[PDB]
Amino acid sequence: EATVARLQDNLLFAIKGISAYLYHARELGYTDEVVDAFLERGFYSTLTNVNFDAEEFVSLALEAGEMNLRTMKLLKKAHMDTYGEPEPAEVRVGALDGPAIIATGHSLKALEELLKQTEGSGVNVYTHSELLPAHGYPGLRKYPHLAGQLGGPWFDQRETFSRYSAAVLGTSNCVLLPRDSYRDRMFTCGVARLPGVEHVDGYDFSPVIEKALELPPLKEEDSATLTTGFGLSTILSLADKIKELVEEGKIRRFFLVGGCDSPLPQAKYYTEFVRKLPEDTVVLTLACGKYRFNSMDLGDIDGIPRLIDLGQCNDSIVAVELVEALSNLFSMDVNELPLSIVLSWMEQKAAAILWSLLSLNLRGMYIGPILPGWANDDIINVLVDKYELTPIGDPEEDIKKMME
Amino acid sequence: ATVARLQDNLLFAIKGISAYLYHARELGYTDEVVDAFLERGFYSTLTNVNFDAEEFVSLALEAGEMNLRTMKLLKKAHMDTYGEPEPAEVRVGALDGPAIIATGHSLKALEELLKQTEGSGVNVYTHSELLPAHGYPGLRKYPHLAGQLGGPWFDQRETFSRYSAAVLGTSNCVLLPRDSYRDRMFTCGVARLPGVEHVDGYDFSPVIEKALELPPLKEEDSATLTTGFGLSTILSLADKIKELVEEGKIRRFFLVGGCDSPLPQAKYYTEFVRKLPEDTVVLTLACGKYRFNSMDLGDIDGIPRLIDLGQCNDSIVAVELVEALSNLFSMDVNELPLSIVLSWMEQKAAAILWSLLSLNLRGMYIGPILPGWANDDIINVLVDKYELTPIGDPEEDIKKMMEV
């Protein structure tokens, strides 16, 4: 039927995300055999004339969410064991004088190697989109020529890359066909590829550095700031203040807003939402959706930041950790916390994280811009009604329903 | 459009590789580099990672290489657990008494079923790609493995209908039951059908119970088939074939086989071998062999005109056999007297075709014609560089294949 095809394609999307995280984990030298065996099994379950059962495909998607939790935890372990655990970090958004390299994507091993290969050369390495969290890691902020942030979300890149006479390095996910304005100024490594752009051999970034030096330098602009790298230790070392502040009702609610973004007009929702959120709530944010609002002056709530940047998409594992630290902190069940979840969700890119969240039986979440919601019975009707997954609507009404 | 089609083709190759890897892990054999390639390949098919078609072709060739590797590892597993396949005569027809018909590919489920059915009084029959099982010494040794019953996979609704026996689908190429036999079929491993029981692990007790609660089978007219031509058997006959091809009494090796379908165009493969001259030998693989593996081809000085290399994943022995033939004739691989006629489905057997292409075998003839194939960019692109030839008329194609 149609639903069997839709369900196997969704499982394949989850397997893709898990494989992304697994690839980056292997690049840092961490490998889990059980997740690889699940990749084999799950992908194999989608060959023609093997499995015709929709409910078994839902079971497989939930097992995929579990495996995604496993590999996200493994990748977090890799990142912390190589670069330290991320601590809060304010980051400059604007050009500094000099030659420059803009690195975009997810991988921190490529950024590590580039930063190692750019010492003393006098080129500034800027982060973009999901390389912003790198600024919070001790073993990465230590390089002083990691200048700051430049640009915002991934889908702005053709704009950003256009207006900065800097070398361009797409390390991983969410890369986009270059304008010929900067095509000959762009490079890729790892798995990312663009036709007509040079691909770095291994981690030998001489071609980019050379290019960065053949280019007119950047000129310093008026900048702005961002905050990122809120690692778990920082958050649950603040547990006393959060306890005291939510017991007196001076912090009413935690909202978890974030996820993979897109230039969809409906995604403007996430800018309005946090804008209308009452000033006595705190927002936990991750992945690219953060650029919908992470530049707003939200303020402080008794010295606790109203915006808390947990990092990149694969840092979902810290959020799920925090809630189990929060529940045990309040002696509450997981669904008794003053927590609402508003996802920004792409079907292709972040199916794995949604299925991980459903594996934990989290009820009443709000889903991404458009609803890929598989129209037919078993999926949308039965699965939504069981997990009470909710499509986003109007910001004010959604906030009213979430506060109650 | 070509990028999407190439991502789909790479994913099909990954499907085949993951199938073979799953069965190999089921027997306890794991190759880390094929799993790392699985990760990389999956990740390279995210929406905004790789936009380069030539790199997707390179990925498909790397997939062919990895498929050769995993087919080799699965052959190693099968041989280390069940022995090396020796030629085997196979009974095609029902013996009176309770019966279980097993279909699919992997022999571990069949091994456990045969282990669990000694003394119980049920006859175990093979179907489709479990026909090669009859050749493994450590598996044919069970005397209640009666023989074969039916032919290709698409015979099942026919076969399963007309034999009141239990039905066990261990693996690929199963399809929704007719209500005549729905309640007597079972599945294990990866296969699933809505409304059919799925065995837990390898506990086939429900199936044997059903085989004993059903009316028994009735005596057959009997027929024969031959299978299990393992490499060792063939290249112990290598001197004789050298002597016979230098004497010009056997002109050409044809390699005909692969995935079949209830497509009318697939009738080609019945006519082809029917028209083949009596001075050629046919090496056959997968289920397509049932187009002709029951024909009276005869002997060429005690060398069988039809030689059944086994099941799809046994392509690896053919790839070895030719490499033994070259060194035997002091010939390079593409001047040997060998023609190759694939029966090929893009979904099911992309991996073996890409393996054959990784080995730079030039001028093969490809599977059945699907009306839409003419415009399909993949056939065009494969043809232009590797001179793959679409099948046309059997007689004309053999004429063009012989006089070279």
Side-chain angles (χ1 to χ4, degrees), chain A residues 16 19-20 24 26 31 36 40-41 43-46 49-52 56 172-176 191-193 195 349, chain B residues 11 14-15 19 22-23 25 32 35 39 42-43 45-51 171-174 176 190-192 194:
Chain A
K16 263 189 252 222
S19 285
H24 294 299
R26 176 165 326 254
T31 169
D36 275 329
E40 303 175 357
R41 275 188 293 100
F43 199 44
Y44 181 21
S45 281
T46 72
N49 293 96
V50 49
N51 167 2
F52 288 69
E56 188 46 35
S172 74
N173 262 131
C174 290
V175 77
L176 214 70
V191 292
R193 292 277 185 157
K349 300 185 207 163
Chain B
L11 278 168
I14 295 295
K15 263 187 189 181
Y22 164 80
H23 297 301
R25 175 165 321 255
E32 181 106 342
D35 271 327
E39 303 175 357
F42 278 139
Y43 183 20
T45 72
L46 274 187
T47 62
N48 288 94
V49 171
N50 168 2
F51 289 115
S171 202
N172 310 132
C173 291
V174 75
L176 267 39
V190 190
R192 291 282 184 129

Short mmCIF file of all heavy atoms in Angstrom, two decimals, chain A residues 16 19-20 24 26 31 36 40-41 43-46 49-52 56 172-176 191-193 195 349, chain B residues 11 14-15 19 22-23 25 32 35 39 42-43 45-51 171-174 176 190-192 194:
data_model
loop_
_atom_site.label_atom_id
_atom_site.label_comp_id
_atom_site.label_asym_id
_atom_site.label_seq_id
_atom_site.Cartn_x
_atom_site.Cartn_y
_atom_site.Cartn_z
N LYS A 16 19.49 7.44 7.67
CA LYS A 16 20.42 8.43 7.14
C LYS A 16 20.98 9.32 8.25
O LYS A 16 22.19 9.54 8.33
CB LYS A 16 19.73 9.28 6.07
CG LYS A 16 20.00 8.80 4.65
CD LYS A 16 19.48 9.78 3.62
CE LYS A 16 18.25 9.27 2.90
NZ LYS A 16 18.31 9.56 1.44
N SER A 19 23.34 7.47 10.39
CA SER A 19 24.59 7.24 9.69
C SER A 19 25.46 8.48 9.68
O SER A 19 26.69 8.39 9.75
CB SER A 19 24.32 6.79 8.26
OG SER A 19 23.89 5.44 8.21
N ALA A 20 24.85 9.66 9.57
CA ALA A 20 25.61 10.90 9.69
C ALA A 20 26.34 10.96 11.02
O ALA A 20 27.56 11.16 11.08
CB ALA A 20 24.68 12.10 9.53
N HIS A 24 30.52 10.74 11.74
CA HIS A 24 31.33 11.71 12.49
C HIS A 24 31.96 11.07 13.72
O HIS A 24 33.09 11.40 14.08
CB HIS A 24 30.50 12.93 12.86
CG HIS A 24 30.07 13.74 11.68
ND1 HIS A 24 30.97 14.34 10.83
CD2 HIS A 24 28.84 14.06 11.22
CE1 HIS A 24 30.31 14.99 9.88
NE2 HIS A 24 29.02 14.83 10.09
N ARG A 26 32.92 7.91 13.97
CA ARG A 26 34.04 7.11 13.50
C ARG A 26 35.23 7.99 13.13
O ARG A 26 36.38 7.63 13.39
CB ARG A 26 33.64 6.26 12.29
CG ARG A 26 34.79 5.49 11.68
CD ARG A 26 34.34 4.40 10.73
NE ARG A 26 33.09 3.77 11.12
CZ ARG A 26 33.00 2.55 11.65
NH1 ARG A 26 34.08 1.82 11.88
NH2 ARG A 26 31.80 2.06 11.94
N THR A 31 33.21 3.91 17.61
CA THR A 31 32.37 3.07 16.77
C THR A 31 31.55 2.11 17.62
O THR A 31 32.08 1.49 18.54
CB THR A 31 33.21 2.28 15.75
OG1 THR A 31 32.40 1.29 15.11
CG2 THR A 31 34.41 1.62 16.43
N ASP A 36 25.57 -0.21 13.94
CA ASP A 36 25.85 -0.64 12.57
C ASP A 36 25.00 -1.85 12.19
O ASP A 36 24.48 -1.94 11.07
CB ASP A 36 27.34 -0.96 12.42
CG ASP A 36 28.17 0.27 12.11
OD1 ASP A 36 27.66 1.20 11.46
OD2 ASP A 36 29.35 0.29 12.53
N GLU A 40 22.28 -2.18 9.09
CA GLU A 40 22.11 -3.33 8.21
C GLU A 40 20.67 -3.84 8.23
O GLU A 40 20.00 -3.91 7.20
CB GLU A 40 23.08 -4.45 8.62
CG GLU A 40 24.54 -4.04 8.64
CD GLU A 40 25.43 -5.15 9.17
OE1 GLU A 40 24.89 -6.20 9.57
OE2 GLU A 40 26.66 -4.96 9.19
N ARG A 41 20.18 -4.18 9.43
CA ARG A 41 18.87 -4.80 9.57
C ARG A 41 17.76 -3.89 9.04
O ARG A 41 16.92 -4.31 8.24
CB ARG A 41 18.62 -5.13 11.04
CG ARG A 41 19.20 -6.48 11.48
CD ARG A 41 18.76 -6.87 12.89
NE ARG A 41 19.32 -5.99 13.90
CZ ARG A 41 18.66 -4.99 14.47
NH1 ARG A 41 17.39 -4.74 14.16
NH2 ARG A 41 19.27 -4.23 15.37
N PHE A 43 17.81 -1.05 7.04
CA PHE A 43 17.84 -0.82 5.60
C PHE A 43 17.41 -2.07 4.85
O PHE A 43 16.64 -1.98 3.89
CB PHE A 43 19.22 -0.36 5.14
CG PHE A 43 19.19 0.30 3.81
CD1 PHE A 43 18.21 1.23 3.52
CD2 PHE A 43 20.12 0.00 2.84
CE1 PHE A 43 18.16 1.85 2.29
CE2 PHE A 43 20.08 0.63 1.61
CZ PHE A 43 19.10 1.55 1.34
N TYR A 44 17.89 -3.24 5.27
CA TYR A 44 17.53 -4.48 4.62
C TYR A 44 16.03 -4.71 4.67
O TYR A 44 15.44 -5.25 3.73
CB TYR A 44 18.30 -5.62 5.30
CG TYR A 44 18.08 -7.01 4.76
CD1 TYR A 44 17.60 -7.22 3.48
CD2 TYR A 44 18.37 -8.12 5.54
CE1 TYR A 44 17.40 -8.48 3.00
CE2 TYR A 44 18.17 -9.40 5.06
CZ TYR A 44 17.69 -9.57 3.79
OH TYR A 44 17.49 -10.85 3.31
N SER A 45 15.38 -4.27 5.76
CA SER A 45 13.93 -4.43 5.88
C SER A 45 13.14 -3.66 4.83
O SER A 45 11.91 -3.83 4.77
CB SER A 45 13.47 -3.98 7.27
OG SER A 45 13.72 -4.96 8.26
N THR A 46 13.78 -2.83 4.02
CA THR A 46 13.07 -2.03 3.02
C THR A 46 13.33 -2.47 1.59
O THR A 46 12.93 -1.77 0.65
CB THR A 46 13.44 -0.55 3.18
OG1 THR A 46 14.79 -0.34 2.73
CG2 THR A 46 13.33 -0.12 4.64
N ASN A 49 9.82 -6.89 -1.54
CA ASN A 49 9.32 -8.23 -1.18
C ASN A 49 10.04 -8.82 0.04
O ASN A 49 10.41 -9.99 0.04
CB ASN A 49 9.41 -9.20 -2.35
CG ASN A 49 8.45 -8.85 -3.48
OD1 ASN A 49 8.84 -8.18 -4.44
ND2 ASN A 49 7.20 -9.26 -3.35
N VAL A 50 10.24 -8.02 1.09
CA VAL A 50 10.72 -8.57 2.35
C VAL A 50 9.64 -8.40 3.41
O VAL A 50 9.08 -9.39 3.91
CB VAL A 50 12.07 -7.97 2.79
CG1 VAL A 50 12.08 -6.46 2.73
CG2 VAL A 50 12.42 -8.45 4.19
N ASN A 51 9.34 -7.16 3.77
CA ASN A 51 8.46 -6.82 4.88
C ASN A 51 7.33 -5.96 4.32
O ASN A 51 7.59 -4.90 3.73
CB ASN A 51 9.24 -6.10 5.99
CG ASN A 51 8.35 -5.45 7.04
OD1 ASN A 51 7.12 -5.53 7.01
ND2 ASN A 51 9.00 -4.80 8.01
N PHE A 52 6.09 -6.42 4.49
CA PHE A 52 4.90 -5.73 4.01
C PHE A 52 4.03 -5.21 5.15
O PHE A 52 2.85 -4.90 4.93
CB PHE A 52 4.06 -6.66 3.13
CG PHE A 52 4.66 -6.95 1.79
CD1 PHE A 52 5.81 -7.72 1.67
CD2 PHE A 52 4.05 -6.50 0.63
CE1 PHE A 52 6.35 -8.00 0.43
CE2 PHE A 52 4.58 -6.78 -0.61
CZ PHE A 52 5.73 -7.53 -0.71
N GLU A 56 5.00 -3.23 11.89
CA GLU A 56 6.39 -3.62 12.11
C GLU A 56 7.35 -2.53 11.65
O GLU A 56 8.42 -2.36 12.23
CB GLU A 56 6.69 -4.94 11.39
CG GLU A 56 8.05 -5.55 11.70
CD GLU A 56 8.39 -5.57 13.19
OE1 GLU A 56 7.47 -5.74 14.02
OE2 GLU A 56 9.58 -5.39 13.53
N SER A 172 30.40 19.49 6.00
CA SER A 172 29.39 18.47 6.19
C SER A 172 28.02 18.90 5.70
O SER A 172 27.88 19.53 4.64
CB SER A 172 29.29 18.06 7.66
OG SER A 172 28.66 19.07 8.43
N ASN A 173 27.00 18.57 6.49
CA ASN A 173 25.60 18.69 6.11
C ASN A 173 25.24 20.13 5.79
O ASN A 173 25.88 21.09 6.23
CB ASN A 173 24.71 18.20 7.25
CG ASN A 173 24.24 16.79 7.06
OD1 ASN A 173 24.33 15.96 7.96
ND2 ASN A 173 23.71 16.51 5.88
N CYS A 174 24.17 20.27 5.01
CA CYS A 174 23.56 21.55 4.68
C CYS A 174 24.56 22.48 3.99
O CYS A 174 24.93 23.55 4.48
CB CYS A 174 22.92 22.17 5.92
SG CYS A 174 21.45 21.23 6.38
N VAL A 175 24.96 22.04 2.81
CA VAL A 175 25.77 22.81 1.88
C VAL A 175 24.93 23.02 0.63
O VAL A 175 23.99 22.27 0.35
CB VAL A 175 27.11 22.12 1.56
CG1 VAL A 175 26.91 20.97 0.57
CG2 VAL A 175 28.12 23.12 1.07
N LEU A 176 25.26 24.06 -0.13
CA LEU A 176 24.38 24.50 -1.20
C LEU A 176 25.19 24.94 -2.41
O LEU A 176 26.28 25.50 -2.26
CB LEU A 176 23.51 25.66 -0.70
CG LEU A 176 22.07 25.88 -1.17
CD1 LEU A 176 21.16 24.80 -0.63
CD2 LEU A 176 21.59 27.25 -0.73
N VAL A 191 32.30 14.31 3.55
CA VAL A 191 31.32 13.73 2.64
C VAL A 191 30.69 14.76 1.71
O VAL A 191 30.14 14.37 0.66
CB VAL A 191 30.21 13.00 3.42
CG1 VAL A 191 30.77 11.77 4.11
CG2 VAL A 191 29.60 13.95 4.43
N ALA A 192 30.75 16.04 2.04
CA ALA A 192 30.07 17.04 1.23
C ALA A 192 30.79 17.21 -0.11
O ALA A 192 32.02 17.17 -0.18
CB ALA A 192 30.01 18.37 1.98
N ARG A 193 30.00 17.44 -1.16
CA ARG A 193 30.52 17.60 -2.52
C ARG A 193 29.66 18.61 -3.26
O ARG A 193 28.44 18.66 -3.07
CB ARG A 193 30.50 16.27 -3.29
CG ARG A 193 31.46 15.19 -2.81
CD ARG A 193 32.89 15.35 -3.35
NE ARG A 193 33.74 14.22 -2.95
CZ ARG A 193 34.84 13.85 -3.58
NH1 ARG A 193 35.28 14.50 -4.65
NH2 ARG A 193 35.51 12.78 -3.15
N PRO A 195 29.59 20.02 -7.48
CA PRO A 195 30.24 19.94 -8.79
C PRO A 195 30.97 21.23 -9.13
O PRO A 195 30.39 22.32 -9.09
CB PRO A 195 29.07 19.66 -9.74
CG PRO A 195 27.91 20.32 -9.04
CD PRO A 195 28.13 19.91 -7.61
N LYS A 349 16.01 15.39 7.06
CA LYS A 349 17.24 15.65 7.81
C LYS A 349 17.14 15.19 9.26
O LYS A 349 18.13 14.68 9.81
CB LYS A 349 17.56 17.15 7.74
CG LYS A 349 17.76 17.66 6.33
CD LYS A 349 18.19 19.11 6.32
CE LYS A 349 17.73 19.75 5.01
NZ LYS A 349 17.75 21.24 5.04
N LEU B 11 21.62 3.76 -3.13
CA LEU B 11 20.86 3.17 -2.03
C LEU B 11 20.46 1.73 -2.33
O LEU B 11 20.43 0.90 -1.43
CB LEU B 11 19.64 4.03 -1.72
CG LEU B 11 19.93 5.24 -0.83
CD1 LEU B 11 18.76 6.20 -0.79
CD2 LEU B 11 20.29 4.78 0.58
N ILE B 14 23.48 -0.30 -1.69
CA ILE B 14 23.62 -0.41 -0.24
C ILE B 14 22.61 -1.41 0.31
O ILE B 14 22.90 -2.12 1.28
CB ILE B 14 23.47 0.98 0.41
CG1 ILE B 14 24.62 1.90 -0.01
CG2 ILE B 14 23.46 0.87 1.92
CD1 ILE B 14 25.97 1.45 0.47
N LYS B 15 21.41 -1.48 -0.28
CA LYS B 15 20.42 -2.47 0.13
C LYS B 15 20.96 -3.88 -0.02
O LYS B 15 20.87 -4.70 0.91
CB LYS B 15 19.14 -2.30 -0.69
CG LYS B 15 18.05 -1.48 -0.04
CD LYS B 15 16.77 -1.52 -0.87
CE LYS B 15 15.75 -0.54 -0.34
NZ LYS B 15 14.48 -0.58 -1.12
N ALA B 19 21.86 -6.50 3.00
CA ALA B 19 21.28 -7.84 3.07
C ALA B 19 22.36 -8.89 3.33
O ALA B 19 22.27 -9.68 4.29
CB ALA B 19 20.54 -8.15 1.78
N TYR B 22 23.90 -8.51 6.75
CA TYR B 22 23.02 -9.01 7.79
C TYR B 22 23.13 -10.51 7.93
O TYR B 22 23.27 -11.04 9.04
CB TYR B 22 21.57 -8.62 7.49
CG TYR B 22 20.57 -9.42 8.30
CD1 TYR B 22 20.29 -9.08 9.61
CD2 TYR B 22 19.92 -10.52 7.75
CE1 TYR B 22 19.38 -9.80 10.36
CE2 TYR B 22 19.01 -11.25 8.49
CZ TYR B 22 18.74 -10.89 9.79
OH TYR B 22 17.83 -11.61 10.54
N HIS B 23 23.05 -11.22 6.80
CA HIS B 23 23.14 -12.68 6.89
C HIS B 23 24.51 -13.12 7.40
O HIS B 23 24.61 -14.11 8.14
CB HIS B 23 22.82 -13.32 5.54
CG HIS B 23 21.43 -13.04 5.07
ND1 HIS B 23 20.32 -13.41 5.80
CD2 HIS B 23 20.96 -12.47 3.93
CE1 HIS B 23 19.23 -13.05 5.14
NE2 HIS B 23 19.59 -12.48 4.01
N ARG B 25 26.44 -11.42 9.54
CA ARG B 25 26.42 -11.19 10.98
C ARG B 25 25.60 -12.25 11.70
O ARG B 25 25.95 -12.68 12.80
CB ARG B 25 25.89 -9.78 11.30
CG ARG B 25 25.74 -9.53 12.80
CD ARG B 25 25.56 -8.05 13.15
NE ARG B 25 26.37 -7.15 12.34
CZ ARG B 25 27.46 -6.54 12.77
NH1 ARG B 25 27.92 -6.72 14.00
NH2 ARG B 25 28.12 -5.72 11.95
N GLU B 32 34.51 -4.53 9.38
CA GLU B 32 34.32 -3.15 9.83
C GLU B 32 34.32 -2.15 8.68
O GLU B 32 33.61 -1.14 8.74
CB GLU B 32 35.41 -2.79 10.84
CG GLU B 32 35.31 -1.39 11.42
CD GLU B 32 34.80 -1.38 12.85
OE1 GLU B 32 34.21 -2.39 13.27
OE2 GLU B 32 35.01 -0.36 13.55
N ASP B 35 30.95 -1.81 6.97
CA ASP B 35 30.05 -1.03 7.81
C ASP B 35 30.37 0.46 7.75
O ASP B 35 29.46 1.30 7.72
CB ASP B 35 30.12 -1.55 9.25
CG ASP B 35 29.13 -2.66 9.50
OD1 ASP B 35 28.04 -2.62 8.89
OD2 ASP B 35 29.44 -3.59 10.29
N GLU B 39 27.87 3.47 6.49
CA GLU B 39 27.72 4.79 7.10
C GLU B 39 27.94 5.91 6.07
O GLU B 39 27.08 6.79 5.90
CB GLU B 39 28.69 4.95 8.27
CG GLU B 39 28.55 3.89 9.36
CD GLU B 39 29.62 4.03 10.43
OE1 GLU B 39 30.49 4.91 10.30
OE2 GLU B 39 29.59 3.25 11.41
N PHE B 42 25.23 5.98 3.17
CA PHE B 42 23.97 6.52 3.67
C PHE B 42 24.05 8.03 3.86
O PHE B 42 23.17 8.78 3.42
CB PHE B 42 23.61 5.87 5.00
CG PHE B 42 22.96 4.53 4.90
CD1 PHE B 42 23.32 3.52 5.77
CD2 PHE B 42 21.97 4.29 3.96
CE1 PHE B 42 22.73 2.28 5.70
CE2 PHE B 42 21.38 3.05 3.88
CZ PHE B 42 21.76 2.05 4.76
N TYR B 43 25.12 8.48 4.52
CA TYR B 43 25.26 9.90 4.83
C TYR B 43 25.40 10.74 3.56
O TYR B 43 24.86 11.85 3.48
CB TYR B 43 26.45 10.08 5.78
CG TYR B 43 26.72 11.48 6.27
CD1 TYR B 43 25.73 12.45 6.23
CD2 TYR B 43 27.94 11.81 6.84
CE1 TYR B 43 25.97 13.73 6.69
CE2 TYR B 43 28.18 13.07 7.32
CZ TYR B 43 27.20 14.03 7.24
OH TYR B 43 27.44 15.30 7.71
N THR B 45 23.84 10.56 0.99
CA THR B 45 22.55 10.70 0.33
C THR B 45 21.58 11.59 1.10
O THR B 45 20.39 11.61 0.78
CB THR B 45 21.92 9.33 0.08
OG1 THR B 45 21.47 8.77 1.32
CG2 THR B 45 22.91 8.39 -0.58
N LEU B 46 22.07 12.32 2.10
CA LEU B 46 21.25 13.36 2.69
C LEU B 46 21.02 14.47 1.66
O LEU B 46 21.72 14.56 0.65
CB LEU B 46 21.89 13.91 3.97
CG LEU B 46 21.55 13.12 5.23
CD1 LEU B 46 22.07 13.79 6.49
CD2 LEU B 46 20.05 12.90 5.33
N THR B 47 20.02 15.31 1.92
CA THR B 47 19.56 16.25 0.91
C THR B 47 20.62 17.27 0.52
O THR B 47 20.79 17.58 -0.66
CB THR B 47 18.30 16.97 1.40
OG1 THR B 47 18.62 17.73 2.57
CG2 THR B 47 17.22 15.97 1.73
N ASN B 48 21.35 17.80 1.51
CA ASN B 48 22.33 18.84 1.24
C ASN B 48 23.76 18.42 1.57
O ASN B 48 24.49 19.16 2.25
CB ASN B 48 21.96 20.11 2.01
CG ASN B 48 20.75 20.82 1.44
OD1 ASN B 48 19.62 20.60 1.88
ND2 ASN B 48 20.99 21.69 0.47
N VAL B 49 24.18 17.24 1.11
CA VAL B 49 25.55 16.78 1.29
C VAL B 49 26.30 16.77 -0.04
O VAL B 49 27.23 17.56 -0.24
CB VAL B 49 25.59 15.39 1.93
CG1 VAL B 49 27.00 14.82 1.91
CG2 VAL B 49 25.09 15.45 3.35
N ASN B 50 25.90 15.90 -0.95
CA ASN B 50 26.64 15.65 -2.18
C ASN B 50 25.74 15.96 -3.36
O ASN B 50 24.66 15.37 -3.50
CB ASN B 50 27.15 14.20 -2.22
CG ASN B 50 27.70 13.78 -3.59
OD1 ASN B 50 27.74 14.56 -4.55
ND2 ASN B 50 28.12 12.53 -3.69
N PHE B 51 26.17 16.89 -4.21
CA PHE B 51 25.44 17.28 -5.41
C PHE B 51 26.18 16.91 -6.69
O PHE B 51 25.88 17.46 -7.76
CB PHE B 51 25.14 18.78 -5.38
CG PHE B 51 24.11 19.19 -4.37
CD1 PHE B 51 24.45 19.99 -3.29
CD2 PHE B 51 22.79 18.77 -4.50
CE1 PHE B 51 23.50 20.36 -2.36
CE2 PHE B 51 21.84 19.15 -3.57
CZ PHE B 51 22.19 19.94 -2.49
N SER B 171 13.40 -15.14 4.18
CA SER B 171 14.08 -13.94 3.68
C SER B 171 13.40 -13.32 2.46
O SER B 171 12.17 -13.25 2.39
CB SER B 171 15.54 -14.28 3.36
OG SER B 171 16.33 -13.11 3.36
N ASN B 172 14.21 -12.85 1.51
CA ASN B 172 13.73 -12.00 0.43
C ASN B 172 12.74 -12.71 -0.49
O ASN B 172 12.66 -13.94 -0.54
CB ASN B 172 14.91 -11.47 -0.37
CG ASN B 172 15.97 -10.87 0.51
OD1 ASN B 172 17.15 -11.16 0.37
ND2 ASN B 172 15.53 -10.11 1.51
N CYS B 173 12.01 -11.89 -1.24
CA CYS B 173 11.07 -12.32 -2.27
C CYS B 173 9.95 -13.18 -1.68
O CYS B 173 9.79 -14.37 -1.99
CB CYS B 173 11.80 -13.04 -3.41
SG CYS B 173 12.83 -11.91 -4.38
N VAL B 174 9.18 -12.56 -0.80
CA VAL B 174 7.92 -13.08 -0.30
C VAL B 174 6.85 -12.05 -0.61
O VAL B 174 7.12 -10.86 -0.76
CB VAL B 174 7.98 -13.40 1.20
CG1 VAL B 174 7.94 -12.12 2.03
CG2 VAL B 174 6.86 -14.35 1.61
N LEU B 176 2.31 -11.19 -0.24
CA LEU B 176 1.03 -11.35 0.44
C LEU B 176 0.31 -12.66 0.12
O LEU B 176 0.14 -13.02 -1.05
CB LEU B 176 0.10 -10.17 0.13
CG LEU B 176 0.12 -8.99 1.10
CD1 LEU B 176 1.52 -8.69 1.60
CD2 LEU B 176 -0.50 -7.76 0.44
N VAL B 190 14.03 -11.17 8.74
CA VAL B 190 13.64 -9.82 8.36
C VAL B 190 12.27 -9.75 7.69
O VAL B 190 11.64 -8.68 7.69
CB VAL B 190 14.72 -9.23 7.44
CG1 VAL B 190 14.51 -7.75 7.21
CG2 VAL B 190 16.10 -9.47 8.03
N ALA B 191 11.78 -10.86 7.14
CA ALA B 191 10.55 -10.84 6.36
C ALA B 191 9.33 -10.67 7.25
O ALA B 191 9.27 -11.18 8.38
CB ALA B 191 10.41 -12.13 5.54
N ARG B 192 8.34 -9.95 6.73
CA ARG B 192 7.10 -9.72 7.45
C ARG B 192 5.95 -9.62 6.45
O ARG B 192 6.11 -9.06 5.36
CB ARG B 192 7.15 -8.44 8.30
CG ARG B 192 8.09 -8.53 9.48
CD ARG B 192 7.44 -9.31 10.59
NE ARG B 192 8.27 -9.34 11.78
CZ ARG B 192 7.85 -9.03 13.00
NH1 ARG B 192 6.60 -8.67 13.23
NH2 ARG B 192 8.71 -9.09 14.01
N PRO B 194 1.56 -8.83 6.76
CA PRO B 194 0.43 -8.56 7.66
C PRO B 194 -0.50 -9.77 7.76
O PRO B 194 -0.97 -10.30 6.75
CB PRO B 194 -0.26 -7.36 7.00
CG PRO B 194 0.06 -7.55 5.54
CD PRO B 194 1.51 -7.95 5.58
#
